[PDB]
Amino acid sequence: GTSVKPIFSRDMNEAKRRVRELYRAWYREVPNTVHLFQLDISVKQGRDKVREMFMKNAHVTDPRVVDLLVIKGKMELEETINVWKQRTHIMRFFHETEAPRPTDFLSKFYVGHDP
């Protein structure tokens, strides 16, 4: 029951199919992105980052949430392909000027009060 209306997919199988299609499109786009934006990363780095972004949301079990995630990923792909994005936008995925924040207890205790 729970009486919900879908966006595109009726169960997780169709949602997974759409996820795979979007992943294929991003995988094909990465080399062109590296060429056009004149990025100093490799194609391997770009595809690894695409996989990491996809795996960030691997725990989702709602087909509607997956449909919205695919819609957002398609929005980002359309944005990248048309060059609406600049090199700064593409490089924002890699956080190159962010100092690594530690995760163990002792370093956090040393730096400050935040957990």
């Binding site: 966006i7 919205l68 929005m75 090199r87 000027t97």
Partner: protein, 208 residues
């Protein structure tokens, strides 16, 4: 009551009440409520499934003729199970009138795009999607319109913080503009202004 109080208009109030009754009788499938505000502003609450029929009837009917869409926006009310309130404002030039149509949705439920009924909605629905995250089904070209490229989240939502989560600055080592977690030299100072004494008895709620 004369010099400083806004005058009333009962004729327009009666006309709008009668027309609201008219609209409700013609479309019982979707119309849930009809209201006439004290300053003569007709409001019609409907079911989401009736977004396209209602508007179509309102813009096409001989006695309606609301051929112009002033604006279309959304309101976020987190306490409601259906978070978002979709508000259409329509103007009739033939009858020199205005009408407001309201419906509801939540985060995961699409609303039918009304680009077919009104061409003006295109950018309005894109803006609602960008600011609030409300998806519109069958929209020609749905994408962000106001926010920056790659911006995460929807700013107009009540939960979103006023200054957001990231800022921008130019970094010389990478020779480009970078986005970093927001740090503020001076924090925005939250004021508590609400008076502990009630202002308007006419709006008092039952004590539950």
């Amino acid at each position: 009551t004369r010099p400083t109080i806004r005058p009333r208009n009962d004729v327009v109030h009666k006309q709008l009440s009668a027309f609201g009754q008219y609209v409700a009788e013609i479309l019982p499938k979707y119309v849930q409520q009809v209201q006439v505000s004290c300053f003569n502003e007709l409001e019609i609450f409907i079911h989401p499934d009736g977004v396209i029929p209602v508007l179509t009837f309102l813009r096409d009917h001989t006695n309606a003729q609301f051929k112009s869409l002033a604006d279309l926006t959304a309101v976020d009310v987190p306490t409601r199970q259906n978070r978002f309130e979709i508000v259409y404002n329509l103007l009739s030039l033939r009858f020199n009138s205005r009408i407001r149509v309201k419906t509801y949705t939540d985060e995961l439920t699409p609303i039918e795009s009304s680009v077919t009924v009104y061409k003006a909605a295109n950018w309005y629905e894109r803006e609602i999607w960008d600011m609030f995250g409300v998806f519109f089904a069958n929209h020609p070209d749905l994408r962000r319109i106001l926010t920056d490229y790659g911006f995460e989240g929807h700013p107009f939502r009540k939960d979103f913080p006023l200054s957001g989560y990231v800022e921008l600055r130019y970094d010389d080592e990478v020779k480009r503009v970078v986005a970093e977690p927001v740090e503020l030299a001076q924090e925005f100072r939250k004021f508590d202004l609400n008076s502990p004494w009630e202002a308007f008895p006419a709006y008092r709620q039952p004590p539950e």
